Design an enzyme around this catalytic site. Structure first.
Site, PDB file in Angstrom:
ATOM      1  N   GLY A  18       0.841  -1.190   0.000  1.00 50.65           N
ATOM      2  CA  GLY A  18       0.000   0.000   0.000  1.00 50.65           C
ATOM      3  C   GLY A  18       0.877   1.240   0.000  1.00 50.65           C
ATOM      4  O   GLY A  18       2.108   1.126   0.025  1.00 50.65           O
ATOM      5  N   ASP A 134     -13.108   8.332  -3.761  1.00 51.25           N
ATOM      6  CA  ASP A 134     -12.053   7.571  -4.454  1.00 51.25           C
ATOM      7  C   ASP A 134     -12.548   6.161  -4.864  1.00 51.25           C
ATOM      8  O   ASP A 134     -11.760   5.229  -5.035  1.00 51.25           O
ATOM      9  CB  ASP A 134     -10.707   7.577  -3.639  1.00 51.25           C
ATOM     10  N   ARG A 138      -9.953  -0.563  -8.309  1.00 49.05           N
ATOM     11  CA  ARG A 138      -8.701  -0.874  -7.575  1.00 49.05           C
ATOM     12  C   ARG A 138      -8.832  -0.778  -6.039  1.00 49.05           C
ATOM     13  O   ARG A 138      -7.979  -1.310  -5.316  1.00 49.05           O
ATOM     14  CB  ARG A 138      -7.542   0.023  -8.039  1.00 49.05           C
ATOM     15  N   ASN A 139      -9.862  -0.063  -5.560  1.00 48.40           N
ATOM     16  CA  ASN A 139     -10.218   0.021  -4.138  1.00 48.40           C
ATOM     17  C   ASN A 139     -11.365  -0.880  -3.725  1.00 48.40           C
ATOM     18  O   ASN A 139     -11.885  -0.714  -2.642  1.00 48.40           O
ATOM     19  CB  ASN A 139     -10.529   1.471  -3.735  1.00 48.40           C
ATOM     20  N   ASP A 152     -10.045   1.128   1.009  1.00 45.75           N
ATOM     21  CA  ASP A 152      -9.530   2.555   0.780  1.00 45.75           C
ATOM     22  C   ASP A 152     -10.214   3.541   1.588  1.00 45.75           C
ATOM     23  O   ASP A 152     -11.052   4.236   1.011  1.00 45.75           O
ATOM     24  CB  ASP A 152      -9.831   3.230  -0.642  1.00 45.75           C
TER      25      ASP A 152
END
Ligand SMILES: CCN1CCC(Nc2ccc3c(c2)/C(=C(\c2ccccc2)c2nc4cc(OC)ccc4[nH]2)C(=O)N3)CC1
Length: 261
Positions: A18, A134, A138-139, A152
């Site tokens: 991360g 966000d 990908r999160n 996230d």
């Protein structure tokens, strides 16, 4: 509220990285409870005191929520070093790279069930007045039974609504815009939104009424739902309660997912 003794964690294997350190798989075991599986985020030596409170901002906000489509906080380790956040281990990792790996290999119904879980987690966050800002594939993380969960906690031009770019007004309605981009990413098995284009090319196209086309083989009613989320006017977008029930209607009436251009 969930301070966890450090003798209760055994770190097993690095599995990612991360923004502020390594991410590992591991085992948690406290007196009187079963042993369970956890992911562990660390922050090793060399950092400021506002960098530390921003790492741990993730755990404070995340310990607020409880929902099957929101990643669970098991606990934290602060009183010692290295510093740690412990969360739930997610066997199939990030959603975009899980789908690219599995490209063409899951049915429309399965893809719709993923999107419905993410919408449900979004519907719950909006109800708690939390605006994610966000939201992107990908999160979202995926477990062994294909259950999708928003992570996230704590700007990505191509996931972001126009009025959030121009004016920094971030709402649940701008999260709805980002959600339609997640639909596209999911139905295109993790293709990158607006493929070639640069951030300013993306902004110029959107203002000039361009909208991402349907992925190959994408039911027409999923695409419309994407276009509904991409309306310039933020108040005409569906809210997440409406999104989840549109998807539920598709799942009960699977003959509506056969029709395509
Ligand atoms: C900027 C992107 N964000 C995405 C989420 C990251 N936080 C986070 C919280 C909890 C997690 C994982 C990652 C997690 C991962 C994982 C670790 C780092 C990045 C992305 C995902 C995980 N990766 C895996 C790969 C695997 O091999 C394919 C198998 C299981 C995996 N689990 C996992 O199991 N549980 C923080 C960074």
């Amino acid at each position: 509220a969930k301070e966890i003794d450090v003798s209760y964690v055994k770190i097993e294997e690095v599995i990612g990285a991360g923004e502020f350190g390594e991410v590992c798989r591991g085992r948690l075991k406290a007196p009187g409870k079963k042993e369970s599986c956890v992911a562990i985020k660390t922050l090793k030596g060399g950092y400021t005191e506002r960098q530390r409170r921003e790492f741990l901002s993730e755990a404070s906000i995340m310990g607020q929520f409880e929902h099957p489509n929101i990643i669970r906080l098991e606990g934290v380790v602060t009183n010692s070093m290295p510093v740690m956040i412990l969360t739930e281990f997610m066997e199939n990792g990030a959603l975009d790279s899980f789908l690219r790996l599995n490209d063409g290999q899951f049915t429309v119904i399965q893809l719709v069930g993923m999107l419905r879980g993410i919408a449900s987690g979004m519907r719950y966050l909006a109800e708690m007045s939390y605006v994610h800002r966000d939201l992107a594939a990908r999160n979202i993380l995926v477990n062994s039974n294909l259950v999708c969960k928003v992570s996230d906690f704590g700007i990505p031009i191509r996931w972001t609504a126009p009025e959030a770019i121009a004016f920094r007004k971030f709402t649940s309605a701008s999260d709805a815009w980002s959600y339609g981009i997640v639909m596209w990413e999911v139905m295109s098995f993790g293709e990158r939104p607006y493929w070639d284009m640069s951030n300013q090319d993306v902004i110029n196209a959107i203002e000039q009424d361009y909208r991402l086309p349907p992925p190959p083989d994408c039911p027409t009613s999923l695409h419309q739902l994407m276009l509904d989320c991409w309306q310039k006017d933020r108040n005409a977008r569906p809210r997440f309660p409406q999104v989840v029930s549109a998807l539920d209607k598709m799942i009960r009436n699977p003959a509506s997912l056969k029709i395509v251009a």
